[PDB]
Amino acid sequence: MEIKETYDFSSIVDLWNKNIGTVYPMNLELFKQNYINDRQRKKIMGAFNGEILIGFVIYKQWTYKSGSLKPNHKIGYINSIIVDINFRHQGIGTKLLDAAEEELINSGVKILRCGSDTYHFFPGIPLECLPSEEFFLVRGYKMQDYFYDLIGDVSKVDFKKKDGFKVNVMKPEDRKGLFEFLEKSFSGRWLEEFIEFFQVGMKERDIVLIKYKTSVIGFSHIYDNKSSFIGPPIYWKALLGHNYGGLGPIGIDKTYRKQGLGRLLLYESLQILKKREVKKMVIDWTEKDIINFFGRFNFMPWKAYRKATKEVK
Amino acid sequence: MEIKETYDFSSIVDLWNKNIGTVYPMNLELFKQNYINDRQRKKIMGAFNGEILIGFVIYKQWTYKSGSLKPNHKIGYINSIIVDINFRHQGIGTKLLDAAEEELINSGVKILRCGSDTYHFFPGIPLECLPSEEFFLVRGYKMQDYFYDLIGDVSKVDFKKPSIKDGFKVNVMKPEDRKGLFEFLEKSFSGRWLEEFIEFFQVGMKERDIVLIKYKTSVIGFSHIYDNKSSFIGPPIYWKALLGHNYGGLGPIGIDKTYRKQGLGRLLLYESLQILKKREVKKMVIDWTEKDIINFFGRFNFMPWKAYRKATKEVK
Ligand SMILES: CC(=O)SCCNC(=O)CCNC(=O)[C@H](O)C(C)(C)COP(=O)(O)OP(=O)(O)OC[C@H]1O[C@@H](n2cnc3c(N)ncnc32)[C@H](O)[C@@H]1OP(=O)(O)O
Ligand SMILES: CC(=O)SCCNC(=O)CCNC(=O)[C@H](O)C(C)(C)COP(=O)(O)OP(=O)(O)OC[C@H]1O[C@@H](n2cnc3c(N)ncnc32)[C@H](O)[C@@H]1OP(=O)(O)O
Ligand SMILES: [Cl-]
Numbered sequence: 136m137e138i139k140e141t142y143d144f145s146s147i148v149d150l151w152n153k154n155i156g157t158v159y160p161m162n163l164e165l166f167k168q169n170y171i172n173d174r175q176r177k178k179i180m181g182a183f184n185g186e187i188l189i190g191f192v193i194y195k196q197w198t199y200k201s202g203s204l205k206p207n208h209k210i211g212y213i214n215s216i217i218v219d220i221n222f223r224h225q226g227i228g229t230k231l232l233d234a235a236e237e238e239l240i241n242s243g244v245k246i247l248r249c250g251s252d253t254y255h256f257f258p259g260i261p262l263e264c265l266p267s268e269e270f271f272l273v274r275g276y277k278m279q280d281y282f283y284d285l286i287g288d289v290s291k292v293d294f295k296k297k298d299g300f301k302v303n304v305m306k307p308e309d310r311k312g313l314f315e316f317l318e319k320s321f322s323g324r325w326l327e328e329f330i331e332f333f334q335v336g337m338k339e340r341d342i343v344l345i346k347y348k349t350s351v352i353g354f355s356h357i358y359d360n361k362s363s364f365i366g367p368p369i370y371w372k373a374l375l376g377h378n379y380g381g382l383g384p385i386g387i388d389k390t391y392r393k394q395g396l397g398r399l400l401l402y403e404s405l406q407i408l409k410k411r412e413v414k415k416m417v418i419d420w421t422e423k424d425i426i427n428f429f430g431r432f433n434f435m436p437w438k439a440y441r442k443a444t445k446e447v448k
Numbered sequence: 449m450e451i452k453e454t455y456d457f458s459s460i461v462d463l464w465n466k467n468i469g470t471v472y473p474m475n476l477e478l479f480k481q482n483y484i485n486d487r488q489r490k491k492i493m494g495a496f497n498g499e500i501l502i503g504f505v506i507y508k509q510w511t512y513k514s515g516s517l518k519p520n521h522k523i524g525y526i527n528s529i530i531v532d533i534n535f536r537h538q539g540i541g542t543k544l545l546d547a548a549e550e551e552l553i554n555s556g557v558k559i560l561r562c563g564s565d566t567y568h569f570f571p572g573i574p575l576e577c578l579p580s581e582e583f584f585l586v587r588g589y590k591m592q593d594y595f596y597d598l599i600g601d602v603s604k605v606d607f608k609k610p611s612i613k614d615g616f617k618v619n620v621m622k623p624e625d626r627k628g629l630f631e632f633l634e635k636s637f638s639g640r641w642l643e644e645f646i647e648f649f650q651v652g653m654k655e656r657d658i659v660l661i662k663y664k665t666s667v668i669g670f671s672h673i674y675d676n677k678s679s680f681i682g683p684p685i686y687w688k689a690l691l692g693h694n695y696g697g698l699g700p701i702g703i704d705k706t707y708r709k710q711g712l713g714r715l716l717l718y719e720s721l722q723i724l725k726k727r728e729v730k731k732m733v734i735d736w737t738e739k740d741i742i743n744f745f746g747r748f749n750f751m752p753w754k755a756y757r758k759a760t761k762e763v764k
Pocket of ligand 1: 261
């Protein structure tokens with residue numbers, strides 16, 4: 136059994152699907168999009184029996200800026216790790232994770248996270264992967280709070296509907312105002328996302344803006360089967376059926392919160408998706424305390440993910 | 449707004465599907481199967497605006513024996529409660545649960561449970577219904593541990609048979625094994641599983657849905673398996689609308705206490721799955737498992753799919 140670098144994305148995707156594809160169905164397009172475009176220092180280590188892939192870990196160090204933020208080099212990530220089911224409990228996972236942790240630690244990482252990376256597949260350890268929590272815990276990762284992907288069917292329910300506030304799809308002329316808003320209200324990871332996604336296929340039609348007069352005060356990113364950029368809400372579209380969609384992120388300026396404007400933006404974003412003939416759709420990577428906000432629109436927790444962090448000693 | 453008894457199963461199914469049908473797709477065949485054949489003292493109270501159902505609660509008291517066991521009349525169950533999305537936060541849920549609880553308390557109930565009933569739809573509060581936990585908490589229910597439904601695709605993996613001791617062999621049930629099945633169950637699982645065997649055989653369960661393990665001639669264990677031909681719809685295949693073409697399921701599975709911890713369960717499981725895999729089964733579910741038993745099933749590539757939280761209110 137050899138441990139060595141690999142970039143055979145087809146072999147990886149095949150193994151992923153054989154092992155967890157029922158719940159995290161992976162296509163090669165998504166895998167490539169996410170891996171090739173990520174700007175962090177990144178590596179894939181594979182476990183091999185001769186030329187046959189029997190497991191892999193993907194891992195990253197935070198070395199690229201996030202909007203107005205400079206990289207914190209102390210932070211590393213396990214994007215994913217999977218050993219094939221017929222090769223479990225032989226030490227391969229341990230060897231893979233050791234290789235990745237050693238490399239990260241040698242490069243200055245002091246805090247290791249399970250998912251939550253740029254171009255993540257996972258916000259945290261999936262509930263479907265709950266048995267792996269024992270493997271991580273033994274290896275010094277602390278199990279923290281939960282995040283949730285929510286699911287709803289916008290075709291299924293009708294909802295009932297403020298001076299100077301308007302919500303419309305983005306037009307190309309809005310670009311400048313969108314970026315000023317982000318620089319001001321969401322200047323980290325959501326800003327970085329907007330910058331990078333526009334360089335790899337996101338259209339203005341996927342963005343809804345709420346304005347007060349001329350000024351942008353919040354946004355959503357929405358998804359359907361015509362979107363070219365494949366974002367987290369539609370990662371798992373194989374489970375969502377036909378005319379699938381998604382929504383996230385969504386944010387309002389802190390100054391304008393708690394007066395129903397989030398609710399208006401959400402309502403109008405959904406109506407737009409509804410008129411695009413969307414049915415089943417996902418809202419990604421929510422905290423518990425915000426579920427009810429989307430739940431008023433009949434969204435329910437679908438998938439859960441457990442945050443998990445190892446402090447290097 | 450009016451609260452009254454209802455048996456309009458169609459309107460209930462529609463309301464269910466409108467509100468939670470993306471993750472718990474209900475149909476009338478399943479609903480009727482589980483509601484009508486339940487033998488407990490049972491009721492549905494509906495909430496209505498004029499003629500229109502806007503909410504319901506289904507609830508039960510343990511009044512019917514469970515195999516060798518007498519009922520414990522102190523246990524009541526909330527089988528399900530759903531208020532329509534367009535009428536939430538108006539106190540309808542409170543009203544319905546108040547009436548359900550009051551009736552149950554007056555018949556001698558001291559322990560109220562969220563799901564887990566006979567002919568349940570849920571083992572506990574679904575994780576998809578997590579925001580309800582807070583609703584139940586306000587009422588004095590206490591949140592305990594979790595159960596899981598597991599999922600796998602038995603078409604995608606091959607396993608080496610586990611190495612088997614002489615005298616043991618595993619076979620689909622035949623119609624004469626019946627006598628010795630019930631002797632095994634009376635001896636080894638004489639509550640809920642015995643009872644369900646009794647009842648399920650009367651409403652379409654078939655020998656082909658049962659696998660049995662034997663030491664020479666004696667029945668030492670069983671599994672219940674399911675596919676698109678099963679006419680009894682049990683827990684593993686409740687949500688078969690989410691499982692695609694050629695769905696299946698497995699559960700319960702049990703080994704006589706004296707034969708445990710020697711690999712016999714693993715053999716029973718392996719062969720039960722082999723049978724399924726030969727029947728062209730693809731995605732399948734294993735229902736209502738505890739955390740300590742997930743990895744027994746996980747060896748065969750099963751993964752937790754749905755989670756339910758145990759929740760109990762003590763009447764004071
Ligand atoms: C951020 C994320 O990626 S979250 C998603 C996590 N991934 C998954 O859940 C996918 C499914 N699971 C898996 O792929 C695997 O179960 C993994 C990756 C979690 C673990 O890989 P494995 O190769 O089984 O790990 P490994 O065999 O090193 O360790 C498992 C146990 O077997 C033990 N072991 C090692 N060698 C042997 C042996 N020869 N015989 C028996 N046991 C052994 C290890 O000591 C370990 O026990 P411990 O945890 O008590 O120390
Ligand atoms: C065992 C099982 O069935 S588990 C599955 C449970 N069901 C579900 O999850 C299905 C989806 N959810 C629902 O159908 C609903 O949200 C339910 C059934 C959980 C709650 O129903 P509702 O009718 O909205 O509840 P109800 O209005 O009585 O009270 C809830 C809240 O409404 C508000 N409220 C209560 N009464 C009033 C009133 N008269 N006017 C305005 N607001 C009110 C309170 O904020 C209360 O808060 P709390 O939840 O902290 O107590
Ligand atoms: Cl941000």
